[PDB]
Amino acid sequence: MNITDIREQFPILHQQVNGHDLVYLDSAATSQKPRAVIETLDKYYNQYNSNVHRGVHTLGTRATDGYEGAREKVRKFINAKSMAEIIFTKGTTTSLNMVALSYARANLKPGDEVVITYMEHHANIIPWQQAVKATGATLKYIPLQEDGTISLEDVRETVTSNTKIVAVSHVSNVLGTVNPIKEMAKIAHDNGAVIVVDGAQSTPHMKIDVQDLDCDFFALSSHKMCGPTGVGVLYGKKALLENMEPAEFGGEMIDFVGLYESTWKELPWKFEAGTPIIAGAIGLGAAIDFLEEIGLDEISRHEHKLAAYALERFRQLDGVTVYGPEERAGLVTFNLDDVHPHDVATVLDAEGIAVRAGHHCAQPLMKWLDVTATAAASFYLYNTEEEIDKLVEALQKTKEYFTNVFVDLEH
Template structure:
């Protein structure tokens, strides 16, 4: 269906407020998205009617909670087109998912002299775990070549890849540049080299259709709170045979099969990796979020956000004194700097106009160094943002420049 943001916004009550006596324009969606009424009501209904611990309970509420929790797993499986429900593991978020792959899988297959390949555009969550694994295993951390406009140089990657390159950890979409990486092509190259690919999908899953089977990635990680769901819930997808090799990182209840006095055996997937009481309400919430996204349509969301990008980017790049980072083909994420004004001052000035943007290094300090800057302003859009909001954002930039006495740039 065609997206009507005016109608959609009625589902997001938080957007209907004033900030500093101005209508709120929320452009911090890369950090976290707002939640529709259907998600809020579904989580509340769980606590009001079905709250109990999952799995081994035999009473009615426990059965309801278990059914809701496992239905959520099935919904995620279908949403990302996983082959088996056992390939969907509930975690706290992208960060935990990536850490589990690093510690529970990569640390077992890497040996001294092997290479872990990353890109300069990685979020710290998809870099720091690999730094730690490299220290622990004796592997090397190697950075992919990147073009000046912030894309992976695929041909150079193919040329430099060697037998020591055992694992590629790569973002599907950059949280700073908006770059969408060619995951299937990268996966094919890695697999031809008998390597593995781990994908950070936090900035992709909310904004475009994702088919992990078609991407042929080995592991894929994402967070609920960036796709309308509550905080504290995320997904680790892995190919079954590889996920089955992943050593649990948390030990205790629910993940065991038998417990003896001195040793234990562990449950089958997926439960072996979900020790302790899980975030049941978060799982319920991510199902409700997926249901909402599917009612709108992921293809439609991607198309609508492209239209917003086509409105914002050409104008942003023509404003005097503005440096914009990233390629022309991108998600609706725009990182930029205004000459002579610190990003935090810019963000504060936007906030005075009711516009929520983010300023800082965006958990991507190596990328900041690569770009030759310390920080930037970031405006990130979602499908509930309107063209009028995009226009007002652009019109506010000269106001910000004038406020700081920078109007002649």
């Protein structure tokens, strides 16, 4: 894995902001895209754009082959058994919402439990809150340990014979914890529940094998893994998707349409109303080819290196608190003691450094950590040790700068 060679593939990194080299450490909000992806989109709009699934004219055929080819790339990428299990959506949020609407809201009665965890992104909270409100079921939260991980015992405790759904993140965007999805699936299934995995933060960073994880549903977002904006995937087990009603209706997903009643296509088209996201899906194909050429295990190893290096260098700074465990994905959430995270991020941007400050779409988790906001930095396959050095230096400098102003005003 050569990082110089990889960085040469990302045009956006070769620029300055505020007079300094850009240092992009915001990949957990959105990743950057290599030439291969961008040029895939260009080629699509310049040469073979058309509507798909009609195949009566040449361009339409090319477009169709690109689009369904991309479906097959997604299938191999997460190791699903069939393309019928791979549905293209607007992104992880929409995917999770489809499950909550079409699965939860048709199969929850009073009595039923939906169990989430406290570390969940909002996409994996609000749909369930709304499903339980609409059906008079009840929502339960699996508690967290002191280091922000989840114990399987707490899981065994929370899920009972009344649990219909367990909804959890593979990887937390805030704590960087990697949840024990495979064991949690076995637990859920023992109690007769399905598991829905939010795989937004795992898919870009590590091999996903839905047959190994044994999850029922699994959601991911293109923009987090070098892909075009605007597109995501829902994987679901063919037997469950066969029994779910579509979330949206219109052309493309129907077979026969009468005045009053209509029948649906086979999977996957049953779940794709309207002209699909053609170019974004083909670009996502391109992103997958790119990551598979580097190797997901290689990417994973790289991320291990950067995260370990960052935890060490953060521990060398006084007055910084890091949240989450030792074993983690490639991100660090943190606060400078006595400086608000928004201020940290703005000062960091004056040095060319892009990080996130705020609630990270995890307000319940913010409350659990006992804070209003945090700062967060995330590494990806284009990041280096040098970049973490610049971050720690700028945090040192920020500490000095705020203290100096405080002391100055004190006199």
